[PDB]
Design an enzyme around this catalytic site. Sequence first.
Site, short mmCIF file in Angstrom:
data_model
loop_
_atom_site.label_atom_id
_atom_site.label_comp_id
_atom_site.label_asym_id
_atom_site.label_seq_id
_atom_site.Cartn_x
_atom_site.Cartn_y
_atom_site.Cartn_z
N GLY A 77 31.14 56.39 43.21
CA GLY A 77 30.34 56.37 44.42
C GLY A 77 31.10 56.56 45.71
CE1 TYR A 95 37.46 57.71 34.15
CE2 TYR A 95 38.66 57.12 36.14
CZ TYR A 95 37.47 57.22 35.44
OH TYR A 95 36.30 56.82 36.05
CE1 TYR A 119 27.70 50.49 35.02
CE2 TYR A 119 27.21 51.31 37.21
CZ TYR A 119 28.04 50.62 36.35
OH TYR A 119 29.22 50.07 36.80
CD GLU A 142 30.57 59.89 35.35
OE1 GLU A 142 31.30 59.23 36.10
OE2 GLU A 142 29.45 59.49 34.96
CB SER A 143 29.80 59.47 39.14
OG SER A 143 28.69 58.76 39.67
CG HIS A 145 26.12 57.30 35.83
ND1 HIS A 145 25.74 58.62 35.90
CD2 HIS A 145 26.94 57.09 36.88
CE1 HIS A 145 26.35 59.20 36.92
NE2 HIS A 145 27.08 58.29 37.53
CD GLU A 185 23.24 60.79 34.07
OE1 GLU A 185 23.71 60.13 35.02
OE2 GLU A 185 23.95 61.46 33.28
CD1 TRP A 213 32.83 50.57 34.73
CD2 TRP A 213 33.94 52.52 34.57
NE1 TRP A 213 32.27 51.29 33.70
CE2 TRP A 213 32.93 52.49 33.58
CE3 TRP A 213 34.76 53.64 34.66
CZ2 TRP A 213 32.73 53.55 32.69
CZ3 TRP A 213 34.56 54.69 33.77
CH2 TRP A 213 33.56 54.63 32.81
CD1 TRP A 232 27.83 49.14 29.90
CD2 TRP A 232 26.62 47.66 31.07
NE1 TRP A 232 28.41 49.02 31.14
CE2 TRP A 232 27.69 48.11 31.88
CE3 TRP A 232 25.73 46.72 31.59
CZ2 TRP A 232 27.89 47.66 33.18
CZ3 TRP A 232 25.92 46.27 32.89
CH2 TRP A 232 27.00 46.75 33.67
C1 LIG Z 1 29.16 57.69 40.43
C2 LIG Z 1 28.28 57.53 41.67
O1 LIG Z 1 30.46 57.94 40.91
C3 LIG Z 1 29.08 56.37 39.64
C4 LIG Z 1 30.39 56.05 38.91
C5 LIG Z 1 30.22 54.75 38.13
N1 LIG Z 1 31.29 54.56 37.15
C6 LIG Z 1 30.98 53.43 36.31
C7 LIG Z 1 31.40 55.74 36.31
C8 LIG Z 1 32.55 54.29 37.81
#
Ligand SMILES: *[C@](C)(O)CCC[N+](C)(C)C
Lengths: 540, 540
Positions: free
Chosen positions: A119, A130, A334, A199-200, A444, A331, A83, A436
């Site tokens: 985040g 992606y 992580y 996502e997230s 997540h 969820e 990531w 992991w």
């Molecule tokens: C979400 C808060 O955006 C967490 C994203 C974490 N990753 C590993 C998917 C980037």
Amino acid sequence: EDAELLVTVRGGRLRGIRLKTPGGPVSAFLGIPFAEPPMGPRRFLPPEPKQPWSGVVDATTFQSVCYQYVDTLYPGFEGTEMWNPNRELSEDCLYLNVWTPYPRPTSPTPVLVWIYGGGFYSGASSLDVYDGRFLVQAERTVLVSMNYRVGAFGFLALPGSREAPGNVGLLDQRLALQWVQENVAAFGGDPTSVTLFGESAGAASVGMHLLSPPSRGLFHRAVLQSGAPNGPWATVGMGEARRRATQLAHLVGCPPGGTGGNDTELVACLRTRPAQVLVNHEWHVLPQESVFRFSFVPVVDGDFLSDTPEALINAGDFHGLQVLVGVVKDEGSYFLVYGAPGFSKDNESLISRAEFLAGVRVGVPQVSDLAAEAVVLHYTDWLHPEDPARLREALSDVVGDHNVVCPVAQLAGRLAAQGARVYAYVFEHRASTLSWPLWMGVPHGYEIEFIFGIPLDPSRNYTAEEKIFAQRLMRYWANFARTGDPNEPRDPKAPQWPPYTAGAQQYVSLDLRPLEVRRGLRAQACAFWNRFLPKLLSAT
Amino acid sequence: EDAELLVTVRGGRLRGIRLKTPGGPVSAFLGIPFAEPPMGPRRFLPPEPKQPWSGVVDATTFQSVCYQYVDTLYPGFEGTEMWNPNRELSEDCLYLNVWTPYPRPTSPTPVLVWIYGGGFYSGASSLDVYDGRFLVQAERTVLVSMNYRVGAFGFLALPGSREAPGNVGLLDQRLALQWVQENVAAFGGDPTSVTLFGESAGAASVGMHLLSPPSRGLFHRAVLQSGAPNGPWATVGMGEARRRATQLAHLVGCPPGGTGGNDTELVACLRTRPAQVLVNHEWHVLPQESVFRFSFVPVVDGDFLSDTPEALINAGDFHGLQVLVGVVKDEGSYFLVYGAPGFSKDNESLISRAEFLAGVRVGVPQVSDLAAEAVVLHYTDWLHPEDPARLREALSDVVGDHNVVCPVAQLAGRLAAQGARVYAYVFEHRASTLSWPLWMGVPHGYEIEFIFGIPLDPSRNYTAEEKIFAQRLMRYWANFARTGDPNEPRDPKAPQWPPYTAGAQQYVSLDLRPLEVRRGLRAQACAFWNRFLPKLLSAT
Ligand SMILES: *[C@](C)(O)CCC[N+](C)(C)C
Ligand SMILES: *[C@](C)(O)CCC[N+](C)(C)C
């Protein structure tokens, strides 16, 4: 052939690239500028449309990642570094990418826009997971993904100010959507069939675009994966946003000395600082020790969000909209290795009763001792109150339900009961490549590689079953983009995916086995979070 | 033969009676006086020992029932009238009964003392379901049962007063235990092996006798069926007791006019009133509409109970004591037809969401709106929040757990973890003769007829399986009385009954099938009542 690698959009001309997948080539345009570089006096400001250029822009490689913190919790570990940024960091980063089938479609094709998570402090559209080459080749659709500013550069807000209004990372996303409206037809895409999916923090972004009028006219369907705009982490108030922005300025030496502290001179001093200086202090402005909390996130400013996401969902009409929403099985696991005492990715994380009680204060920050007592009651197995493996799973459910599963179920219920057709899923397959530990289950963000068809990449050691699984999931997402209905429009033999209603609360589970319908998105646990806990906090 | 029907105790001589059971005769002594009649100036006062008499007292028939309210909710219905008085009502009522085997045992035999329930406001030792002829014949033990004053005559308390000190109904029970100490040997009973057992308010009485020093020297083992001294209904405070006693005096015309209201003249006026006058106003002094709440119950006076039952259980040593405790499957259903809106014994009682929310205020009186909100959260099925049959069962669990199951589990845990050997059961058989509707399951108090061997009565239409079931249960209770261990001291084939520990929380289920061990006395539900709810009430 190479005739289709040169496209003219309203800014100018572009040269694309032809990528190969095991079943045919695709046409990609990676690195198209859609805004002026937000540097110098443009830092913290909303984006400006990209001015037209001359010659041809090279759109054959991904551009630079927006400045962001780089995870160093586990250096050299695939789970975290997959990531991390895979291009040079620069504030010159507002670029988007278009994948289109080869040969170019002759009739308007539905468009999927991807919005990454992280985040609101990290992430990039250039990540390997992606890559839109597999999804576009197999389902013959148009995939678009952009970069948006993250962290302070995207979401530092001094409310009321004109120099740092906030939410400009969302404004970067909106400008990209206007761009897709004005240019996707040049790649064979239907500007009247646009499906956002994220996502997230990408799913919270998709959600906030549903609740702001100017952005709703730019898309027609929404997919929210493991995130929602009403989640306790996706939003901050004007008072707290001001405090975090000011604490950040203080940590980097603004105001110097010495001088008064109005907003104009605070931002003027913040704009003279090197980008890496602001990044190195970004985590130091958080109020508590906590997991699943991030410093600079969307602000309720009354402009982009006229009211809180909770209020806007409750008082909105969603007729004529289709939404796909869902979560993965675990969820919360992580984030526990990011602060919860007793947790380490390199052992069984068999925590004690004392560490569990401390972890609850970290996983649910900013709540009274009584409120924490309610969380301990609801999530303790009073038949085995000190079983380490049970408390491990309990804390993962505490973080998971509080931040993702319950915020999502809340959104899905009201959307269905207010005009929207909603489909719900639960991702329960754990990839055979998952680096992991086993006890984290399916964590997540590890459905994404299956939505994008990554298992089809021959240089990866996926199983034959997982390849069929990926192709099935890609059809679901594509079908929802074409028809608004994940079920195949005519084939009946495969089990069907019923809509999600506030009453029946039906959802399917996605794994190697056929579709199985279930009822209840953790209904018992989520009633505590969505109903009882709010009242427990109002009463002191 | 008839030589054994004449016994001399320390008061005088008695003539007994010989009763017949299908497998042999028994010797009974029904109606032995153990106290002076508490009438006239003796009303509300502690009992005095019975003075010695001359001639022989006739002990061949049950004496008079203590004055009590008579249930008229369902006139002519077996379910309610089986508990109504079957002898004339009189304040002259302090009599006890002894069943003894024929021929009289030659060696000291263990003694069981029965204490009836009825919410401290009703009940009698002369009821048909408390007939001790079957238990004594089959297990060759000595059974004793007494009458104690109930209602205002037993528990009207003006604390600090000497005219109405309170708890004298418990003092009647204690005097009977001293009597068994001083006379049971004349019937063949061992005064060194005395086992108390009661049900409902009888079980709370047994419990309170465990927590008061002067009574503990009168018995050696305890059986608590569907009741405990720390239950929210079994105890009242000195301030509330004074208020209910004064409200009662006001309703019957005391003080007249007219005159000051000190305690001596209030009781002096209460003593001139006919017994039926005090009874007709007994339910009119309750503070709320509620089920499972009764007007005049034991008071925390600092004498019989030096502290609250909760405090006394927590700060006590119980080494060298064996206790048998347990509940029936549906502890709460019985009381819902006494006030809960929507409930009737003559239909399916399929209540609505609105009636359920109102029933919670009745089944859990004297709690804040927030506290009720927690009860609704924990006891709602959020997958079917308006299913009438589920809300029916939920309210029965609300009343059952709050008043019986959780108070019992609390007591059992601390007793085991503080020296006492504790065995726990759950009665899950529904009698084929049960006249209450089907939806009540197995209701409060319908294990008693099986403990006393009532199915062996040939004039009753019980099944052959239920007769074997009764004989099995009678052996359990008898074995616990002889050895302190319900398991048969030598036979191994039949499954064994493990003790109840605070950690494993093991219990057996009693029904037509063999013993089955289970873990947890509603551990999840009871953690709410025993742990979280107390804290929710301290914080406003
Ligand atoms: C979400 C808060 O955006 C967490 C994203 C974490 N990753 C590993 C998917 C980037
Ligand atoms: C308990 C409070 O004493 C209830 C007793 C009810 N009967 C039916 C068993 C008398």
